[PDB]
């Protein structure tokens, strides 16, 4: 034999590792200035003859992304003004809207005393607050947060628009993308390719419907940590988008109220025009057969003769019973009980979803720090594209030929999981020792 | 398609005798003990792993679908109801006696 140890430096071998990836991006809540400029032409090196064991649910890029997003939110909310004077007693009447029966109190014309530039003086001012923003103490109300937390008003110049952020690993680390299509979320992947940075991942805060995400490649893909478990949310990724047109048709004029020296409180003054209801339109002929594809792909997991039923949300917070999102700066909460009402047996009309607008937002499931989104002048309309769902099975006695699926809650780690499913971080260990005939 | 099957419907054993309670199932099975309709307690989580504070008399082993619950050196406390659980489904359990 007479083999001897030879040291090779820079061999292509890697192991699983966790590292603080940095952000590259091509005013916002997610700072474009703070992130480095992205590469003009990314490199995708295809690793032939490589099989890699991926895992969606133990991916640490999701946890790091969530921590970075929360910290960006906090950093954006830090320099803005504090609305501690606003937690006072408010005399609230109905905004003049004839008598709409139900939904009449959705806007409340509330008058309150506010502090001025001079500490010794007060001013009687008024503002239009939503019903969800206030709670009764016959006309005495207070903001809903006044016992639980304090509000910081979001800066008006700061925009909540998602920007595509690319997560690049540092030196000595590699990001392996699983180019394989129909790859569920876990286990082997024979089509692998290393990248410098991940694709543009828009941070979109949404519940029951993933918006502005990746559109898959071949077919609708269902991914859950275990299909048998009920507690695990099911992530569905569409192969074609479902367009959704969301609008807040109230003009909603904005006014400035000096609460202190150099501090302003932006408050809705008047709706110029008819008082209407915010909503979202989804195509019916698209959403049906999109649910058809989803049912066809769920029947692979749950059996061929099963009756796949879709029902609306069982209960919970407002962020989970309703599709919550942010459109142009205002926070919509849409019913979506018309979307998820179906029963599938093995064998230019729009769905209008009524949305309630909110201003006092407790983001990232945190309690103890609330935000007050300012009003927005003019009508706001947005066109987003549904690329997926979060779902939850009913469980229980599933021995029967029925399977009820309801929309799932907002953890926001499932939102990042649907985008970072293909990406894994590894550390390259360049040192190696092999046997060869050579000697010193 | 979860299925459960527990073999002893009724069970009587002497003190100091090793007992084996067979529960056949598919998936993550956990063993619990209920005494006289009072609140259960977790003996075994997963196939074999023992919870903290549980007596070492109880242990579990895994082979295929079957789990054994090898309890050794029965004592006056061990006489109680014993049942197996996979997720949301719980079969009615046996009842140790003397």
């Amino acid at each position: 034999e007479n083999l001897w140890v030879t040291v090779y430096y820079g061999v292509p071998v890697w192991k699983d590792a966790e590292t603080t990836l940095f952000c590259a991006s091509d005013h916002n809540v997610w700072a474009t200035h703070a992130c480095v400029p992205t590469d003009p032409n990314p490199q995708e090196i295809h690793l032939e003859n490589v099989t890699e064991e991926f895992n969606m649910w133990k991916n640490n890029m999701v946890e790091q992304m969530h921590t970075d997003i929360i910290s960006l939110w906090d950093q954006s909310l830090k320099p803005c003004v504090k609305l501690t004077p606003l937690c006072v007693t408010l005399q609230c009447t109905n905004v003049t809207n004839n008598i709409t029966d139900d939904m009449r109190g959705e806007l409340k014309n509330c008058s309150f005393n506010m502090t001025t530039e001079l500490r010794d003086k007060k001013q009687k001012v008024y503002s239009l607050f939503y019903r969800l923003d206030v709670v009764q103490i016959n006309k005495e109300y207070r903001l809903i947060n006044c016992n639980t937390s304090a509000i910081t008003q979001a800066c008006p110049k700061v925009s909540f628009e998602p920007i595509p952020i690319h997560y690049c690993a540092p030196a000595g680390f590699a990001i392996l993308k699983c180019k394989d299509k129909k790859f569920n979320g876990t286990g082997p992947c024979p089509s692998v390719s290393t990248v410098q940075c991940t694709h543009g991942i828009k941070p979109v805060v949404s519940t029951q419907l993933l918006l502005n995400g990746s559109l898959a490649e071949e077919e609708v893909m269902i991914r859950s940590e275990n299909i048998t478990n009920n507690a695990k949310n099911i992530l569905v990724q569409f192969n074609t988008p479902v367009q959704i047109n969301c609008t807040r048709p109230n003009n909603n004029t904005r006014k400035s109220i000096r609460i202190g020296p150099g501090q302003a409180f932006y408050a809705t003054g008047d709706i110029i025009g008819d008082i209407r209801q915010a909503h979202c339109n989804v195509s019916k002929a698209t959403w049906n057969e999109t649910l058809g594809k989803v049912v066809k792909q769920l029947r692979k997991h749950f059996g061929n003769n099963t009756i796949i039923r879709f029902a609306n949300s069982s209960g919970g917070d407002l962020e989970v019973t309703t599709h919550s999102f942010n459109c142009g700066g205002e926070f919509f909460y849409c019913n979506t009980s018309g979307l998820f009402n179906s029963t599938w047996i093995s064998n230019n009309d729009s769905i209008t979803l009524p949305c309630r607008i909110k201003q006092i937002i407790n983001m990232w499931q945190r309690i103890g720090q609330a935000m007050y989104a300012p009003p927005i002048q003019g009508v706001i309309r947005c066109v987003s594209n549904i690329t997926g769902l979060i779902l939850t099975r009913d469980g229980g006695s599933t021995n029967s030929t029925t399977e009820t699926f309801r929309p799932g809650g907002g953890d926001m780690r499932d939102n990042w999981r649907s985008e970072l499913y293909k990406y894994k971080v590894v550390k390259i260990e360049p040192l190696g020792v092999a046997p060869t005939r050579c000697k010193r | 398609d979860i299925q459960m099957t527990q073999s002893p419907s009724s069970l009587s054993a002497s003190v100091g005798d090793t007992v084996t309670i067979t529960c056949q199932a598919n998936g993550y099975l956990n063993w619990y003990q209920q005494r006289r309709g009072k609140a259960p307690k977790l003996l075994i989580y997963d196939g074999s792993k023992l919870e903290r504070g549980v007596p070492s008399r109880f242990s579990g082993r895994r082979w295929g679908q079957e789990y054994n619950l090898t309890i050794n050196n029965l004592q006056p406390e061990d006489i109680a109801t014993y049942f197996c659980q996979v997720y949301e489904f719980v079969v009615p359990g046996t009842r140790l006696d003397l």
């Epitope: 949300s313 209960g315 917070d317 989970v320 009913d394 809650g409 | 259960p40 977790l42 659980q85």
Partner: nanobody, 121 residues
Framework: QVQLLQSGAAVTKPGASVRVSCEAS????????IHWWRQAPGQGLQWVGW????????????QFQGRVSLTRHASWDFDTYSFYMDLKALRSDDTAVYFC????????????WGSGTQVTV
Amino acid sequence: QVQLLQSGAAVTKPGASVRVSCEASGYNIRDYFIHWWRQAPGQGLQWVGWINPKTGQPNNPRQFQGRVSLTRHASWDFDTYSFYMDLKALRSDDTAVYFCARQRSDYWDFDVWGSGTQVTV
């Protein structure tokens, strides 16, 4: 120091709602799902449903859907959490005892169960 107290046993006529309370304290209540179990006398345990503490989302079987409501309430500082189970349409079959259990992991190991609340109809 994990502790899941439960309310006293209740008696009510059919068709009148109950309010079974389960007070959880001594641990981080938010990360662990709280499930509900129902034991008829002389019968094995049955599952009523889980509730996420963070989001408040219930999940119930088709047998109990439309009747059972799982809710949760948080005090100041969130050290004590009150999980309520309310059955709307009561019936002689529902004569069971109700436990609130704490799932700790993917295993569905219910480490801590409640004392119980005998609901008699």
